[PDB]
Amino acid sequence: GLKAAQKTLFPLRSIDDVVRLFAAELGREEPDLVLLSLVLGFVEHFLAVNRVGLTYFPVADLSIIAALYARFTAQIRGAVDLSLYPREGGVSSRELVKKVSDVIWNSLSRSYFKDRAHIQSLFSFITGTKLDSSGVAFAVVGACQALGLRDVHLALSEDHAWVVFGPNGEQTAEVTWHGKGNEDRRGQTVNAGVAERSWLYLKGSYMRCDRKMEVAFMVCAINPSIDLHTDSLELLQLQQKLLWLLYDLGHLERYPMALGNLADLEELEPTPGRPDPLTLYHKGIASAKTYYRDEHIYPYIYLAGYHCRNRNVREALQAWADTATVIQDYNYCREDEEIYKEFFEVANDVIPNLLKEAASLLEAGSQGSALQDPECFAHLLRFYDGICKWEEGSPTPVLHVGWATFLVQSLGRFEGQVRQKVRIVSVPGPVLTFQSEKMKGMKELLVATKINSSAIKLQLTAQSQVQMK
């Protein structure tokens, strides 16, 4: 049941009234995830999905929100009989967590597009019987909270979600699917994935949320997109304000991606008196270094994207080199395709486009150009080195000849006299050490006035032979 004190701010008539509700809930012992997600989903539906009749803000009446809450609590209480699953010691059992996951899963529409916008919240679950993959995990945690299961909490990697629970919160369970066409592991631990050093499970350096971080998750999960060309200004403002509320209370400290989201929002529309986007991206990286062993990729990707948008080639290259320095200590495994796609895009599309423009501007007489800076050439080489090291020891390869044409083109954007300045030093001006055997063998080829394209291709793909005839 909603408690009397949870109801006093209704009706919610504005963005600021929604912020007041979040502030009130975050001031409580246990913020009510079900209430909060139903409110966000309600307001997102009427600001992004269907804006017919909108004049300012979709007023959220208690009668409407309370009826949605009742549908959820009735579905969960009726379908999960806690007496079947006695709790030793204030903690939940694997079978109980599996039962709640089954209840959510079985409620979903038989057939729908899982990749759509606006199917993340409990409002989508109730009104449309549709959830995306992490939406199911969040719904399991919200259902568990509604049931009194204080130990069940959301776990997050950079591309997946599951739950932690049990004695000392040390158990893991899969509760949702990952990707498309992968085999389901619902009910199992994540230990095989941690042990194989995949990106998907972050070598165990994943987020273990408390209830406040679960609030931050649902706020990050707001989707302002109305269509491909249009965002809801109202939802952008709501998300931004809610993220600052969380930040001020300390609840983004251990949430690198939320800090990057907040930085991106500040870049779009700065809040007076607040830290610059750059400061916020760096806070996100600092969060990953402090709490997650610097084993997260996306803090650096957020930073590089900012530099790329501002056509700051030097700083973008630096940030992508730093991204690669993280990935080098992973094994590239079968469900890590999203981060492969990110690195492929950066190497084979984004960097080429940046350097093409830089080349034209150099022709027109630019000073201080990245293309005349040997430290920038070094960043490019460190980016490729990290990708090559990533591949070493991995069950599936990364590089192939499709990468080679772009490597040769990108190297060629720097004149030989610039390339010559980098000193490649072994273990045991600009200096660089390579970690990968591929780049060590390429060293020779990196300072010739005209790059030997064929030799580069052979070294990058460890294709051994050239054409017979």
Author numbering: 2 to 53, 74 to 386, 399 to 461, 548 to 588
What does the published report state?
pmcMenin, a 67 kDa protein encoded by the MEN1 (Multiple Endocrine Neoplasia 1) gene, is a chromatin adaptor protein that interacts with MLL1 (Mixed Lineage Leukemia 1, also known as KMT2A) to regulate the expression of multiple genes, including HOXA cluster genes. Menin has been identified as an essential oncogenic co-factor of MLL1 fusion proteins found in acute leukemia patients. MBM1 binds to the central cavity of menin, utilizing Phe9, Pro10, and Pro13 as energetic hotspots, which occupy well-defined hydrophobic pockets, and positively charged arginine residues (Arg8 and Arg12) that are involved in electrostatic interactions with the negatively charged binding site on menin. Importantly, recent clinical studies found emerging resistance to Revumenib treatment and patient relapse as a result of somatic mutations in MEN1, leading to point mutations of T349M, M327I/V, and G331R/D. Understanding how these mutations affect menin structure as well as the interaction with MLL1 and current menin inhibitors will be crucial in the development of a new generation of inhibitors maintaining their activity against menin mutants.
We also solved the crystal structures of these menin mutants, showing no structural changes in the MLL1 binding site on menin. We found that point mutations in menin do not change the protein structure and only minimally perturb menin residues surrounding the MBM1 binding site. In contrast to the predictions from computational studies, the crystal structures of the menin mutants revealed that these point mutations have no impact on menin structure or stability. Recent studies found that one of the most frequent mutations, M327I, impairs the activity of Revumenib through a direct steric clash between I327 and the inhibitor. Interestingly, the M327I mutation has no effect on the affinity of MLL1 binding. However, activity against menin mutants is significantly reduced, from 5-fold for G331R to over 100-fold for M327I. Biochemical studies have shown that the activity of Revumenib and other advanced menin inhibitors are strongly impaired by these mutations, with over 1 to 2 orders of magnitude loss in potency. Such an effect is observed for even the least perturbing mutations, such as M327I and T349M. Our structural analysis clearly shows that all these point mutations exhibit a steric clash with the menin inhibitor Revumenib, overlapping with inhibitor fragments that extend beyond the Pro13 binding pocket on menin.
